[PDB]
Every structure is written in C-alpha cells, then in structure tokens.
Curated annotation (Swiss-Prot):
Belongs to the RNA polymerase beta' chain family. The RNAP catalytic core consists of 2 alpha, 1 beta, 1 beta' and 1 omega subunit. When a sigma factor is associated with the core the holoenzyme is formed, which can initiate transcription. This is DNA-directed RNA polymerase subunit beta'. It comes from Mycobacterium tuberculosis (strain ATCC 25618 / H37Rv). The lineage of its organism: Bacteria, Bacillati, Actinomycetota, Actinomycetes, Mycobacteriales. DNA-dependent RNA polymerase catalyzes the transcription of DNA into RNA using the four ribonucleoside triphosphates as substrates. Induction: 6-fold repressed by starvation. Transmembrane segments: none annotated.
C-alpha cells in the first residue's frame, strides 16, 4: 500500500502549500491596499512603515504556521515509513495521528 499512501500524503502536503500561498497572496494584496489607503490620507512615513512591519510580521506568521503543519505531516510520514517494533512514540498527538 506504500504507493497509494505516499500519493495521498503528497496531495495533503500540496493542499497545505496551496492554502499557505493563497493566504500569503491575500495578505500581500491587503498590505499593499492598506498602505495605499494610508498614502491617500495624510500619513507619516514612519506610521506607514509601522503598518508595513506589521504586515510582514503577519505574513511571517502565516508562513511559519503552515510550515509547522508541513513539518508535522513530514514527521508523521517519516515515523510511519520507518515504523518498527520496539520503537517508542513519546508524543500523544503523533501516536494518535
């Protein structure tokens, strides 16, 4: 069954990556649109730089979140493919997955 399991796993990873890229794109267009809204109104360069810093931090959070999900799924796949008797699973979440 390894070929089918590897396929379905690959599809799941793809879904996580596609969702991540969609979130990051929506957040990028939103950041540019918000900075454009603040440039139309009177605004300080330092205030707009604060807004851009916030947007970049949020994108970093989206990419780090999706990256944590990808790493979790990767650990699951490595653990299952290498699974052998006498091996200890310390993480409750990993064993339940």
């Amino acid at each position: 069954e390894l070929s089918t399991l590897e396929a379905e796993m690959a599809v799941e990873r793809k879904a996580v990556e596609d969702q991540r890229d969609g979130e990051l794109e929506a957040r990028a267009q939103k950041l540019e649109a918000d900075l454009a809204e603040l440039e139309a109104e009177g605004a300080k360069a330092d205030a707009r730089r604060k807004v851009r810093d916030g947007g970049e931090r949020e994108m970093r959070q989206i990419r780090d979140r999706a990256q944590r999900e990808l790493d979790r799924l990767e650990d699951i796949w490595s653990t299952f493919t290498k699974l052998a008797p006498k091996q200890l699973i310390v993480d409750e979440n990993l064993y339940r997955e």
